[model samples]
Target: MKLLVVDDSSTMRRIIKNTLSRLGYEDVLEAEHGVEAWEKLDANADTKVLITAWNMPEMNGLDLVKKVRSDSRFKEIPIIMITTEGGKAEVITALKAGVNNYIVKPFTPQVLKEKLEVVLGTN
Candidate 1:
């Protein structure tokens, strides 16, 4: 399974990649923001999953999800949001924006794997 990861922070992207690796997701494409992610999607329409960070420059994760979902090609891709921002309101906002699942920051790698499996319907 290929995953498109959109996050402006290189460190965060690396960490997520590493975690996914440990969870057995070997194929990944990285992007700094929504614009880059869109470019990647256009080039690789087969990507079926996205794991994004909420806050980013150029375009945030929500914008990226909205952009993907608005298009027919990527509307079926599962988008899981990983963000530091907390609180019920923000979570609700992300849900309304069409997030498949939400994960708070500082989560254990195991927890991340479990969430990813949940989102993807992997047993």
Candidate 2:
């Protein structure tokens, strides 16, 4: 399955890409923020999963989640938000916005895999 990862930091994007590779997810498309992410999603309909950060310029993850949920084309694709905002309210907000799962930043590969499994129903 193709994966889309959205984040502002080049380092964080690379880390996510590398971690995904280690977990056997080698096909990934990356975006610097939500706008680019939407463009990528529109252009590439094959993406099966989305991993996004909360903080970003132009558009934030919550807005992205809302847009994705509203769009019929990509609404069924699973989303796992990756963010530093660990507040309970933030998590509930993301869930309300239709994210399938949430993961705080600085997570280990195991956490990433576990979250993905939970979303994908492979656990």
Candidate 3:
């Protein structure tokens, strides 16, 4: 499946890519932040999923989720937020905004894979 992994940290992005690769997902894409991810989505409409981090520099993941949900073209794509924000309210906001799933930071690859599988039927 085509996946878009968005984050501001290069290291975090690489870690996600590596983890997903280990999960047997190879057709992955990366973006520095929400704006960059939106640009990528505009350029590549085939992207099927987005795994993003919150508190990014250019545009936050919550805004990105809002943007995607607001656009008809991208509204239906499954989004799995992997953010540092572990607060109940923030997660509630993201869920209410239309995210498909979410994962907080300090997660193992197994945890991420389980969430992805639950959403994408990967397992």
Candidate 4:
């Protein structure tokens, strides 16, 4: 299955890719911002996991999550949002927008591993 990772920073994307690989997730798609992320999601129906950052230049993560949850076909897909320092208020916002899980910045591979299990189902 495909996993989509969206972030405005290329460095962050690479870091996430490496971390996911370490946790045995390899089939992945990358997007620089929410607009491009939506484009990829539209084209990649097989995308099972969505890892997106909260802030972006075009169509930020909150809007993206809202967009996906609104669409009939994409509504049920698992969404893992990235935020910073426990983004207290924003965390509630993202959850309200329907994110299945979240990875705060400066996280470890093991952290992502566990959160992925929670959203993707522990197997």
Index of the highest-lDDT prediction = 2
Instruction: Tally clashing residue pairs in candidate 3.
Output: 0
Best model number under TM-score: 3
lDDT comparing candidate 2 with the true structure: 0.85
Model 1 quality (TM-score): 0.88
Cα-lDDT of candidate 1: 0.83
lDDT per prediction? Answer: 0.83, 0.85, 0.84, 0.83
Q: Candidate 4, which ten residues in sequence have the lowest lDDT sum?
A: 114-123
Question: What TM-score, to 2 decimals, does candidate 3 have?
Answer: 0.90
lDDT value, residue 58 of candidate 3? 88
Summed over model 4, clashes come to 0
Residue-level lDDT tens digits of model 4 in 45-69: 7788888998899999999999989
The global Cα lDDT (0 to 1) of model 4 is 0.83
Stretches off by above 4 angstroms in model 4 are 108-123
Model 3, span 1-123: residue lDDT tens: 899999998988888887788777899999998899988988898898888888887888888889888887887898898888899899899999887787888677778667666666641
lDDT of 3 at 120: 69
Q: How many residue pairs clash in each candidate?
A: 0, 0, 0, 0
lDDT of 2 by residue, 7-46 (tens): 9999889887877776678888999989999889888988
Cα lDDT of model 1 by residue, 14-78, tens digit: 88888777667889999998888888988999897888888988888888888888888987788
